[PDB]
Symmetry: D2
């Protein structure tokens, strides 16, 4: 139905405000199920479709969720007896909805959640979630495409994660905060979203230590209460605008940006010639006249974030030389590069390596997004392409970016969103 039309050749200048983090708000909404009494109030909630889906998931568990979009605020009342079922209708749209499994085990000792199927970008199975829950004393059945977890008594244990899975970390944390005794998670996810989740759980009465470090220690408690919490800024939306500034000879202040949440991206953009400055008001990015090539390798935090990879390929594809990207977190997250061949991108892909030759002008063309970050990457490429770029499948964009086109317009970009 809709497309974003982009003309290139304009420098981005000004200030940009950033929404609260998609990847923090979804687990924190699930965390609100832990409050047996009181009203949870979340501030700085972004208006994204994944938030609407998660709000539906939670309502279907017998919970009142009001989203005041104007105030960017969600109130949750989970004080009634919860239902325990999250069907494929919701999990098929968004597999993040499975992080309700942990709170449901803590509250009810029972959860019945649809097994996620395929993802475009080539996701992992939920094996590490289940490993965690089994370690805490849960029995796991599968029938009719559902995972049913039952635990009369959750008991703390030592759990080693083979990979530092963000999702498994979140799911297990939220079960363990009400398990009897000590839980220790080794090789936890260290991402800033984990820290924000830990911060709210602690306010709710939990005891979570070492969030953001290699080892997390959780002391179980009997009762959790509701609190007010402001979602941390979205480091990926921030980073997307940092790339946009760096590739357009821009001068853009990302308001209240937390630089410690983008150490990799900042370092890499500086290697490509950008000047990046921490100021009282946020992080300023000044794009160079000559964009220099650099190689990028994605890894679990604190390495380079996979959620910045697609956006980063856009600037690598206009750099003056050959750049390489290696994706070690996702199996099939180069589909945007396949599309950008329509825009005359010279790129060779083999397995989880892509080789980009940026000594070619990008050309406007009609292009279809394949996933959330691919949509942003195609728009960014449009900022530097010659002619007119038309980006479609904006359903993907809306999952993670609010008012992307308007924020870009306000920075001087020639970007419209229109009907076909």
């Amino acid at each position: 139905m809709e497309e974003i039309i982009v003309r290139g050749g304009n420098q981005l200048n000004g200030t940009v405000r950033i929404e609260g983090a998609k990847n923090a708000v979804l687990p924190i909404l699930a965390a609100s199920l832990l409050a047996e009494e009181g009203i949870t109030t979340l501030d700085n909630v972004p208006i994204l479709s994944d938030v609407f889906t998660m709000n539906q998931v939670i309502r279907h568990l017998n919970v009142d969720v009001d989203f005041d979009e104007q105030k960017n605020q969600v109130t949750i009342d989970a004080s009634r007896q919860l239902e325990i079922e999250a069907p494929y209708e919701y999990v098929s749209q968004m597999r993040a909805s499975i992080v309700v499994m942990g709170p449901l085990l803590a509250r009810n000792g029972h959860a019945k959640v649809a097994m996620p199927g395929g993802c475009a970008i080539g996701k992992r199975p939920i094996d590490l979630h289940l490993k965690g829950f089994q370690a805490l004393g849960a029995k796991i059945i599968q029938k009719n495409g559902y995972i049913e977890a039952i635990a009369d008594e959750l008991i703390g244990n030592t759990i080693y994660l083979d990979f530092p899975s963000v999702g498994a970390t979140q799911n297990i944390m939220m079960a363990a905060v009400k398990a009897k005794g000590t839980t220790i998670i080794e090789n936890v996810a260290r991402e800033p979203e984990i820290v924000d989740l830990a911060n709210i759980l602690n306010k709710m009465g939990a005891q979570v230590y070492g969030a953001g470090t290699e080892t997390m220690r959780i002391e179980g408690v009997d009762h959790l209460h509701a609190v007010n919490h402001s979602i941390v800024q979205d480091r990926i939306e921030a980073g997307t605008f940092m790339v946009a500034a760096a590739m357009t000879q821009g001068n853009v202040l990302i308001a209240d940006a937390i630089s410690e949440h983008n150490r990799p991206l900042i370092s890499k953009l500086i290697e490509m010639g950008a000047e990046i400055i921490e100021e009282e008001g946020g992080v300023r990015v000044i794009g160079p006249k000559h964009i220099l090539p650099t190689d990028v390798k994605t890894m679990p935090h604190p390495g380079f974030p996979t959620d910045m990879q697609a956006q980063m390929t856009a600037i690598q594809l206009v750099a003056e030389g050959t750049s390489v990207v290696t994706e070690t977190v996702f199996e099939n997250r180069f589909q945007h590069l396949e599309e950008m061949r329509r825009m005359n991108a010279h790129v060779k892909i083999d397995g989880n390596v892509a080789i980009m030759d940026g000594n070619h002008e990008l050309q406007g063309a009609e292009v279809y997004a394949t996933d959330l970050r691919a949509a942003a990457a195609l728009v960014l490429a449009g900022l530097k392409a010659n002619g007119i770029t038309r980006v479609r499948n904006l359903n993907y964009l809306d999952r993670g970016y609010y008012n992307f086109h308007i924020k870009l317009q306000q920075l001087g970009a020639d970007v419209e969103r229109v009907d076909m």
Copy 2:
């Protein structure tokens, strides 16, 4: 808004008729553009959505195409001056539509075809097509997501294909049949569809030698005429039914099956315990009581066909042990296995290897197809799952299978196609 409902536990018995090959009919329809005079009549044309799309592509080049579905017959009149443009509207639906580029170069010396974008299953770029056309004297421009190829005079040359690409082979053959002098294609595609294409071109007045071998030799001619041609049987539809018989303790005759077009699959099914017999009337497959594990590696013909891989994983997942599949032709063609986790499939994926443990019962669940062959694989899995399987996204199935559910019903399978 349709689904296939499957109950497992039934043995397949009887005879099944197979349609003409999807992968032969699409390039042969393009080949019909070469006939400057006469009416081309194609018989044994399958009723698939890709055929409808290809018929539209060809009409938009100023050609009359009539499809009599009842007779499985298409007449083509390409005797008027051709237009040269194939837009993204069609190429985005089906990238096979680019094989019109070759005939357009031969007839007009001009072609303007949309550059294909991303494919779900992780396709190659069209670099080898363009390499071929440049070798024959074509200039190539890109603008607005179109490849424009201009050739005043096509001149035969020696062309080495880095990979034995079926599509590049087809596109180049069809340009070269009207080039001046000799063309030699080294490391050509050897697939049976190439042979059928060569067979019709030869009847049309062309001189193509060595089709099906490692080296193809083409002597250019001035004029090609229209002919009647019956499309070769679909070896992949045939093979799909061979797998179904082998996994259900079946006894199924695949009518008029060409066994030399399934040497790999036949050999592998026999390794898994099947008895397979060439008869006057076709190939009979008798499924064993104990399905034995086997490993599979996809390769260009004459190795194991990637188009049989998804179907083959279905039988590997009910074999009595661990089986391994290695996909060396496509990057991301294991998404069906991600879905089959909903059906309790125990499978580990890393890169282009998948490890399947078949000592677990499959379970019915709602499952969404991701691509043509994945849809067939999910139905086949349903035949052996306990409970009710519901397969969705039948738009993918209809691209390559005609009346799949009816043919299965006629073999004793409990399969319905119904509205939601």
Copy 3:
């Protein structure tokens, strides 16, 4: 304790003679075990260490082998009762020595051959050899690092190879020529060495059809006799000199070169700017002033030979741009590129891809070969490096090249072989 010293800066000019093929002579020596009566005489046998090793292997089976090095000729008398044991002392030096297993099964119905261990360049297991032998009626035991195969009666059967393994193809052919009835090998190796092996077996009284094609058919016979045979020219030694000419602005005639045995290499060198001509006396290679980049993908014949890959990286590393090589036949055959970093080669490796930037001068340095073809590649790099290159571990070079330095001197190259 020898080294080759190379100074760069000279163009190669002249004629080069090529030895008989290492990869044909080793299996054909094994084939000579099949002759129960008579003296086998092989001509055009190269003086390489692998030939000396194979001659030892065969003597230990109670056979007389005389190597007249001056005449490049080996006589074999295998008319006595054969011993059946080939120990790890020999197989650990050279795993090609296992192709005696096939002839031993045909003559004796018994073979006891050491299981090969690891290879530097990352070889396959011998699973496909054993699959073939089991298919013909052989029982297989493993004990104390030996494979023991017993077959009272070999019986012809259909055998599908999952990969077109040269070694498995050779081993199975040589067992099957004396099996009762018809044998069919599907997805056989198509390499020219297979053809030469088939050619001698046929002269010896066997019936081997379709060698060099996708399907091989063998009709078993009761008796085989000894013959005279001239080994086919070594296409890899030939190809090595073609690369040397192409990278040094050379003009070199490779005497009596069979161009159909280097279709991929010839095509790729022409893509890099070389002019290559079939003449009465052989194949002439004329190197361009400007060496152009090209990408290379190794595959089973008829694709680009892995045995030419290392040599080809040498010319790719001096081409005017970025080139990519993809090795799909061996796991770890880029160790030469790791060494060439000492020569200032700019190359990035990930998995089975290597990315070479040739817009940098190579520099002479002391470098150690890691395997046969790496040794040749380092010498070739020396031809274009600035300064003095010293190549060591010439034990690897002598496995596959006879008088490499002298042949290069005769073409005008500044190459000496000296003691340390």
Copy 4:
């Protein structure tokens, strides 16, 4: 010259003492170059060949090194003017010798170190070392296979490591401790060896903060002095004995073992059925009657250490089912599994994944080690193989294990080391 002979079937019982860490002692020896005045005394130095090589490297820089093997003690006097050259004679034996580059830059502002060549197990280039040194103000030339780094004034800077390279981390830390101002290394190596290096540097008068965390901060100082330091226990030698106990139904106390240095291995061995207990005297491992399969993925610390991978495959290969290992740190570190096919190991390898079927008895055979940890893994496999295992290339074992056979004998293992 020598082999280790192993008979299987015996349970390991007793206490084992562990040497100081190879991977700490080598960089700490290099660190001793920073002391311009005084005598450095290192305690708990293991008697390994890498220590002898490193001692030679350091002497050639005009330094006195005395190794009292009986006291496990090394004194270093680096108070004279240092020479700056480390030739290929030493770097070709052991690429760890390049970590002298950092201290040489700090002391002299000049270093001339041979570029490492190929490694068997498929190492990285030294790009990240050079990136670090360039960031601190060093000029880098390559000529004749040497890297020459010159820096009149080292100046602190922010450095992001694309990969958390242990070697690059060590080299950069040792330069930065004497750079002017603040250095910040982001995505540093977190390994315990880094911590021990930091601990000695701090005692020597340096200011290194955040060792073991994601970010390291270094404040430059003018002068460093000599100290006494006891090398931390070798966590890999410790872990090797933990595996040996776990696979032999053993009961072994690893004296003074630091469990926080083997969180991954301990967790994984417990998943395989072992009982592991922290005691006053160290860590006790009790091997189960039934060894259970588990999957293993190597990663930078704090994930599963690649230096434990080979040893771990030995226990995975006798577990009661199928296990998978994924090696994400090194490209070609599965060569031991290629050898263990001689011992009847059923294993499939593809890329950086290996699939092990442990429902087969291992068999003794002659087997050749390919690298340090492969040698240990083959001995461990011998402990469970039936018959006699003979492990050769003990030159590799001696690089990292002191008196391996004697420590195993003392635990009740049937292990001899003898001449051939």
